């Protein structure tokens, strides 16, 4: 957890300072960001050796050591641009001077020349997948650095070129950096694709752990835009997260469910939901003399509650062998489960071995309320020692802090896997990143962003879909014209503020979009073709586009419609987003 959590970390910490910054939080995000990424040598081995163990592959020492060397002339400059834009903001507008300027306009220039020369090193050929962590890592701190040029460069006295040719290039490297990163992370994916258990594994802690240090720290590139997003920015990341599965045994001898039983049976792309009730079913595993004999958690059912604006439940199919004991329901309603805890236990026979999952016991917390508890599956028959804690793969976004306030993810789904030969059961729980806001709030300060993945209907016969694996979650995917997807939505002020809208999507042709309220048309517009038909869909596949009239939030129920598709015709939608406007 040491690079999971830097990982973590700081995708927490940039969600404080997307959009235009204050120059307040800018200069201590910097200070903190230092002292995580930038440190010392430390981290970037770390970062490397990460991706070496997910992939069972090793980085030739001679491109290892040129990568490092480059990296610690960089976090010399970075450093050194840091401690002096502290000075900048601190001194008043009447101590900047010709001198001062200069002096910071050279650092700047050296630090983002030196970031452009160096990133070759973190790509060489035969080694990208193995240097990925390094090179996103590094490409998130260029385009990170390059925004203060737009934020800065008038009061460094730089003239109207020179920002103007930072700008278009953190444009053109917003979207090299993105499109590296998606293509190696894919390669890399598809390397780990196998047919057993012991293989599903690792293909998805591959999944798990790029997740975490690579596709949602690019998610936020499209923000550091500070210019399309000039004021300070709210938003979320909808993707889930597998945690490891809950085992007793690090080796199953073959036993394990297979890939294509996990994999087809995990979760397909959906609308997003909230974890309501699950429902412990219980066996008895005999043990081989009757001392080492315990009872297990066999199946379960998980009810989700959608997204708001529908209360109505989706109970799930069974998964696993329904119960010997009495069932255990746990109801979650109104509660954040931010930690599971599980203990395993085991017997040996002559020629076998038995193994399940004993206890559960899941911290969580309430913020009508705001009071942190615990809540818990016991098996009641010898339960062994812990053996599994989801804060070891899912860590604190902040240490500072107590767990209930500091946590990364909330608990989102479970399911039970069978194991071949009827031996037992494997425990798969989902996860959910705390980014998520349960009430879709409509800030009146902040620009805000809706992933259309918070409807809680759509219509049309419109599907939710693989995200492209850049916008932080899934997409959704219109082929009819009409309706296509309604999200309730939450002022966060009760007088006339007014909005503009701005979607972003993709399309094969010119299609019309429309924007309802309480049933109401508002808004309706007329937006390009982004894409042509069966292309797949890189950064500049997608497009962010107003609508021209402002609104005000006179109800809840926002729609979005669609029109001019043809036959053959589609439409993907990822956002929608609102920019206060007085």
């Known amino acids: 957890k040491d690079v999971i959590q830097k990982g973590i970390s700081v995708v927490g910490d940039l969600l404080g300072v997307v959009g235009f910054p204050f120059g307040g939080a800018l200069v201590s995000f910097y200070t903190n960001f230092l002292n995580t990424i930038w440190p010392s040598e430390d981290p970037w081995k770390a970062f490397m050796e990460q991706v070496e163990a997910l992939m069972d592959q090793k980085i030739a020492d001679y491109a290892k050591n040129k990568a490092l060397a480059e990296l610690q002339g960089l976090q010399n400059n970075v450093e050194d641009y840091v401690s002096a834009l502290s000075s900048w903001q601190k001194n008043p507008v ?28 973190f ?14 890592q590094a490409a998130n701190t260029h385009l990170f650095l390059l925004k203060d040029a737009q934020i800065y460069g008038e009061e460094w006295g730089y003239e ?54 690579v596709l949602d720290l ?10 399309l997003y000039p004021k300070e920015v709210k938003t979320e990341l909808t993707r889930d997260v597998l945690t490891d599965p809950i085992v007793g045994v690090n080796n199953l001898r073959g036993y394990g469910t ?39 958690w066999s199946g379960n059912y998980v009810s989700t509650r959608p997204s708001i604006g529908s209360n109505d439940i989706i109970t799930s199919p069974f998964y696993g062998n329904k119960s010997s004991e ?6 979650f309603n109104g509660e954040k489960v931010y930690r599971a805890v599980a203990n395993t236990n085991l017997a040996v026979w002559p020629s076998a071995v038995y193994s399940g999952v004993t206890k559960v016991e899941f911290s969580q917390y309430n913020d009508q309320t705001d009071e942190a508890s615990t809540q818990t599956y016991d098996s009641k028959r010898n339960v062994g020692a812990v053996s599994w804690d989801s804060i070891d793969q899912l860590p604190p976004e902040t240490t500072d802090e107590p767990l209930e306030k500091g946590y990364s993810h909330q608990l989102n789904y479970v399911m039970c896997f069978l194991m071949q030969g009827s031996r037992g059961t494997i425990p798969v729980l989902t996860w959910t990143h705390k980014s998520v806001d349960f009430f879709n709030m409509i800030d009146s300060k902040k620009i805000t962003q809706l992933p259309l993945v ?58 019309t979009f429309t924007l309802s309220l309480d049933g109401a048309p508002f808004n309706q517009y007329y937006f390009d073709k982004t894409i042509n038909k069966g292309d797949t869909l890189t950064y500049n596949s997608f497009n962010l586009a107003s609508f021209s009239t402002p609104f005000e939030l006179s ?20 956002k929608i987003e609102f920019i206060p406007v007085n």
């Open 218 to 227: 690019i998610a936020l590139f499209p923000l550091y835009d500070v210019r």
């Open 123 to 136: 790509a060489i050929s035969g080694y990208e997948v193995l240097f990925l962590t390094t090179y996103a």
């Open 454 to 511: 918070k409807a809680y209907k759509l219509q049309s016969g419109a599907s939710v879909v693989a995200g492209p694996r850049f916008t932080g979650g899934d997409i959704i995917q219109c082929t009819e014209n009409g309706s296509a997807a309604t999200i309730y939505v939450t002022p966060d002020v009760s007088y006339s503020q007014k909005y503009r809208a701005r979607i972003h999507y993709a399309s094969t042709s010119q299609i």
């Open 160 to 213: 109207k070129e020179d920002i103007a040719e930072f700008y278009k290039r953190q444009l053109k490297l917003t979207q090299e950096y993105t499109d590296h990163c998606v293509k190696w992370y894919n390669v890399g994916l598809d390397k780990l694709r196998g047919s057993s258990y012991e293989s599903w594994v690792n293909f998805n802690r591959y999944r798990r752990e790029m997740t975490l240090t």
């Open 326 to 331: 009495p069932v255990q329901n746990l109801e």
């Open 555 to 574: 109800g809840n129920n926002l729609q979005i419609g669609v029109t001019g598709l043809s036959a053959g015709d589609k439409v993907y939608i990822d």
């Open 258 to 296: 297979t890939f294509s039983n996990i994999e087809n049976y995990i979760r397909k792309p959906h609308l997003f939901d909230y974890l309501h009730r699950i429902q412990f079913h219980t066996r008895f595993q005999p043990g081989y003399y009757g001392n080492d004999s315990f009872n297990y």
């Open 94 to 121: 009447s101590s900047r001077n010709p001198h001062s300027q200069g002096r910071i306009r050279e650092l700047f220039s050296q630090a983002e020349s030196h970031f452009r020369n160096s990133m070759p090193s």
